[PDB]
Amino acid sequence: LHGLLLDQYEEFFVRQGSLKQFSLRAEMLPSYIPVRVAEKILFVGESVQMFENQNVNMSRTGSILKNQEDTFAAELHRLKQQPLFSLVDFESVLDRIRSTVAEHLWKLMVEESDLLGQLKIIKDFYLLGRGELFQAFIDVAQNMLKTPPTAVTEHDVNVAFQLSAHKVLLDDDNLLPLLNLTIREAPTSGWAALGLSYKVQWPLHILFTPAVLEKYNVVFKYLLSVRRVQSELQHCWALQMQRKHLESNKTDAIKWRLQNHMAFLVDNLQYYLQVDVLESQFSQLLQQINSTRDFESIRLAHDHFLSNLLAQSFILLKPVFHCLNEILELCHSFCSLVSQNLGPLDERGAGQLDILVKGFSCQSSLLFRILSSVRNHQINPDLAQLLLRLDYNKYY
Amino acid sequence: PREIITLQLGQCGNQIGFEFWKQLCAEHGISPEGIVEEFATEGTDRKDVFFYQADDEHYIPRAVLLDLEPRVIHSILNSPYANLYNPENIYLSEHGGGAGNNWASGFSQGEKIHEDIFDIIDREADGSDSLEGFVLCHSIAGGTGSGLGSYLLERLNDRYPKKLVQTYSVFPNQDEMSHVVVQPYNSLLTLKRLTQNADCVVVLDNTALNRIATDRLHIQNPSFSQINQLVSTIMSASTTTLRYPGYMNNDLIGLIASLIPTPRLHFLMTGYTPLTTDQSVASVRKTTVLDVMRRLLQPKNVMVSTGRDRQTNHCYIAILNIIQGEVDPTQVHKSLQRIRERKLANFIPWGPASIQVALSRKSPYLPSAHRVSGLMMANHTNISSLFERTCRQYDKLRKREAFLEQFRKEDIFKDNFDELDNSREIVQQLIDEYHA
Amino acid sequence: PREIITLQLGQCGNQIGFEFWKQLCAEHGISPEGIVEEFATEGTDRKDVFFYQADDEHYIPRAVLLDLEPRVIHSILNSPYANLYNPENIYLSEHGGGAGNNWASGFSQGEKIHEDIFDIIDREADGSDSLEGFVLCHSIAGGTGSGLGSYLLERLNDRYPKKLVQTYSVFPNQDEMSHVVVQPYNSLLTLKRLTQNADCVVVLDNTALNRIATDRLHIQNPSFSQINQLVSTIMSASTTTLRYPGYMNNDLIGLIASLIPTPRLHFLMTGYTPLTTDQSVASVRKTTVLDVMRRLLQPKNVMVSTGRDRQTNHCYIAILNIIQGEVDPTQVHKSLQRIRERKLANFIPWGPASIQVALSRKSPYLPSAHRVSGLMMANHTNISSLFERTCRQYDKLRKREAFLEQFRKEDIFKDNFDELDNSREIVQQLIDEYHA
Amino acid sequence: MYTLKKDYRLVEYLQAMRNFFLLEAGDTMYDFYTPIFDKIREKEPWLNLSYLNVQIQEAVGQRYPDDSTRLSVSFESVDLAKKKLPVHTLDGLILSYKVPWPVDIVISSECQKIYNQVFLLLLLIKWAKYSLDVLQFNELGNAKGQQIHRMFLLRVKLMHFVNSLHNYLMTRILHSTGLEFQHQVEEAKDLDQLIKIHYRYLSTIHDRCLLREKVSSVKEAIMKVLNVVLMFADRWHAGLGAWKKESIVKMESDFTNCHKFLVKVLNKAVCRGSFPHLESLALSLMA
């Protein structure tokens, strides 16, 4: 109610370990209260404690504007001097202090911070829902992420993102510096190493803790990379647009049979991933927020949201993930094979070709071992339906 | 910043771009000389992608309008869409020429106004630093747009091949033969430049529209003016992940990249199903996602003629299926399983192919964003039927002997006529060889 | 005091200076014989930096109106403004002259009313204790205003040469030639005086004027009585640093000095955007500051004729962009950032140019309390375009044998014809040598 | 706040000392300056205390505002304290305002001591800007040879540099601080919160004007450019002969060489954080 954390020598089973820290102590929790009953007392009482900070007119229980706190006082009178202690009598009224109370902070933060606005918007910056307005970035960032990160590159990537979204006309000028991209270090190359920060506000910070902003960044760095290998297969395409660029050499024809295999590749493999990551993960948040006045049912659905994104796009821990990022590395060298001007009529033109036709069948076979395990029953079915769908989509 | 410069050209070629731009203002939810609501920017999250970027609060087209007849643009001078254009810049009002009904009239006027025709489209590119390309909104119909347009297909190809060149070739009307009679001649000269000095064409057949116009709209006699309505809708339909920001293939050279394996096999058959206005009083209760993209494998959604008995003798290589509006997005991956399983098209089995499905939001105006729309942009290899259809009408004219010295008094003093029968059998065989 | 004494001279130069004063009375809300409101000190913080200081609680402008035809000054006593002015310390009622259409009349009339013409400016300067200069609001239109105004550029540059000389010339409409015939002669005669008897000028043109009057004022047929409205406001717009608070360049000689790099390049083109009364309905949604200097660097408001193919072989060198009224003085640095990415101002190909931006607070009045105001004071190196238009009609006129002996009767009896012609050729060449 | 707004007119007093020595005023401090500045131009003693005390009397009577005509009579800022070291260091003006109690608790001496040094740096660029302004208006200082057109190539490069550095940098540092400062007065509850948002006002003004009370590259950026203007104007306040003009364009090639050198230090200062110097760096691109 108050948010009061009382200690005098400290013996409460809730203890202080924004909104402050508070946590369960499980050895100081008695073993006739279950662990799953402890967090109904924790999570209501912390969220009324950060409103004891700011203001009691916002309070989650309600105690000024509403007269529920006297019903809580009655709840207290009955359960204070009960002789024969029970478990059902303890846990039934943990419903009444929570469910009715739990819609009240929900009708606070809809009209205090947006709940419809900000959670598709913060995904348009991470899961990318503004592709052309971010292509303008990939153009400026190609020409300067051929260096590993360094100290001055922190200011360069920022001023670069500033000018790229700005000469385009981003639709709101103040929208522009409530993010910036944050890239000493030498991972390999400056690409797949740049991050992304976003700011946070009041009551939103429990749905967007600084923990989970790493969980959005981690799927971003795989996702910008298959925006990169896609835009490049589109430009290496543009060096082969006409009959004047269609050399009558057979070394050119094996180039032309390659680009029909590889710019068709990323238009399936990286399309059917990427679209299905977004579409029916945005669907299921919107169907909940429109229908459920309760807070924690949306909350843990959005914890299942972010762990499902960083799980579909990170397909299975080791094996499959290594087959896939190696795929986009090997057609990024198919770009550097095409980027020759009068490539195939050269000795090095055919020399470079020969190495890559090996590097490719090291991938078609590596993908093939995944398919035996995909045939083998129940690895992860949604992993196997996606990976076979892009494959029958290479065939038919 | 994929700013496209449109080259609207010809008598009919101005008309098909005229309603293209008039649709775009209707979808931006703004008046043709101002911005009148706030639903324009919140609904449409990028309005400029053909338009000149804003700095006067109104977006202005990047359009050039050339025609030998100044009469189609004077029927635009007094029409209230002269503030969505300019009558001293965008279109030159009183631009002379002949009638024209010659391919060589317009081919030689672009050879003395050669500096000025390429200094009216780089003054329309000065609001983007890195240009997308040029889209040739011109017609093979008549001698105006088809006579002059072949000059622009070469000189924008040797100064700009890096950039996109793409035309919407609207074939001459074959039920005319007494009004235009230079028709087999001007059509095969512009098609010869299209197979080596162009990236893509988008084939459109006129006689195959009027087949659909009497079965889904049922107008008594489809006349040219109700034929420009059917083109302008499919034009705004192809940009729907380029205008409204996608995430995949959000440049126009993105989509076209997987719909062209090899040059001179790039001729796209267009199909568009929501011509039937009995799709709309059924999508008000929802018409399923499980049948809105099976009807893009139906051989009657086509605006273009192709063989039917050559659909079992040839195979599809790349077919893109854009569903729009309402889609229910979580069973769209269930529908794509089901295309291949009935077998509603054939598809090549030897190598790379792609059945691409995409989805997009529409206008914040609900009486045109609650009705299922299906855009097909096919590439089927039985397109060699059209090159035979035009060629059987060419050699039949050269056998009555016309245009073998009645066409060599203006800028031709050579014989390149059997070069056009030959270039067509070259095309038909290299398309036919690619699959097996 | 930074008192500038205005030298209104000419049939047209009087009228454009006349509504310049009435504008100042409409916004200070004053009676022309009494100060009847508290808006004189709350609205405006200096009200006698161009006016004679209060000694009766009233303000008397620092203007002199001398003219050959007393008829333009007799139309000031049929309005309630001949007690705002005085009967001998502003204008002498019934001060005659010539015919007058001859330039050589008005040039000899300054040489015999020579005693009185430098007593009227010093009768009306008994409270200037530190003079700014003399601005000659003298018109080239008519032989009256160009003849006597050319005399006074010389005697005020030999007694006050470091002080401001600056004229608002308006060259009469150069698409008439049967309304005025003495038009190349009176222009080239004052043009000799602007470059070696004068420091800087601010040029205007009439034929580039009326272009705007039908595009932003929307009159039915250009006539002089709307031309004076558009001129009279840009004259009160250029002095909003000196009549209201400021600091950096809060003098009229502070603004104008920084638009000069080299003599013979100081001819300022003027532009003024809020002439349209459909921007007062687009301020309820906010007119922004980001785009109000993207229509000042656009050539649309140009009051000086010039080509649109002479700005691709010439660049602007110094451009001042003055906002009045609303501005938001934290996002004005946000307004200049986007200027460089579009490049609507051209920069000299030999160093960086200059974009000087200014703001000033004003007295309550309609484009300084509800809607954005932009004054441009340009400096472009295509200004040789008027001089070639006037010099090709001057030597052509000598090829019709006009005014080579029908002009040698009154005080021209030597060869001074080639004196105007050649000194104009030094100006046409020296600008081009210093601009690539 | 009821007696501190009507009984004593506190906030009117705040904008009043800002009109004095933050240069927020009109042609009040302008017409004080140009009589003194015409004596500098001919290097004749302008200090001469006495006439200066009558020049600020004449200053506050310009515009007729009626919140400094009333302060010249009683609560005088007429008294200007001058510093004339015999170490030999240039003149420096110290204006002080006698402020009523209990407003004198908000404005102590330590405040006015830092409003001194920002007026000290605004006036110094007023001396380098109006030297470059007025000489362009003078239409040459000397009016082989014919070296003027090749000179006018590198004059307006440094004429425009200096002017825009005091025009476009200045007007943002007077307006943003003053507008967020007026906010914290509108909110104001009591005097102890007023003393704090004014102590945070100078600290904003510090970090704005020139960064640091120690070594920074932006103070070097003022005084290097100042040594350019001193060498330029002293030469141009004198008649020049035939071959003298040849040393001007020779000096000016070196002057633009040292101008480029201090832009390129200042980029190192813009990557180590966010500053107003980002706006200072952008200012130098516009010039």
UniProtKB/Swiss-Prot annotation, chains B, C:
It comes from the Eukaryota. Transmembrane segments: none annotated. Pfam families: Tubulin, Tubulin_C. It is found in: Cytoplasm, Cytoskeleton, Microtubule organizing center, Centrosome; Cytoplasm, Cytoskeleton, Spindle. Tubulin is the major constituent of microtubules. The gamma chain is found at microtubule organizing centers (MTOC) such as the spindle poles or the centrosome, suggesting that it is involved in the minus-end nucleation of microtubule assembly. SUPFAM superfamilies: Tubulin C-terminal domain-like (SSF55307), Tubulin nucleotide-binding domain-like (SSF52490). GO terms for molecular function: GTP binding; microtubule nucleator activity; tubulin binding. GTP binds at A141, G142, G143, T144, G145, S146, G147. Belongs to the tubulin family. One of its GO terms (biological process) is microtubule nucleation. Keywords: Cytoplasm, Cytoskeleton, GTP-binding, Microtubule, Nucleotide-binding. InterPro entries: Gamma_tubulin, Tub_FtsZ_C, Tubulin, Tubulin/FtsZ-like_C, Tubulin/FtsZ_2-layer-sand-dom, Tubulin/FtsZ_GTPase_sf, Tubulin_C, Tubulin_CS. The keyword Plastid does not apply. One of its GO terms (cellular component) is spindle. This is Tubulin gamma-1 chain.
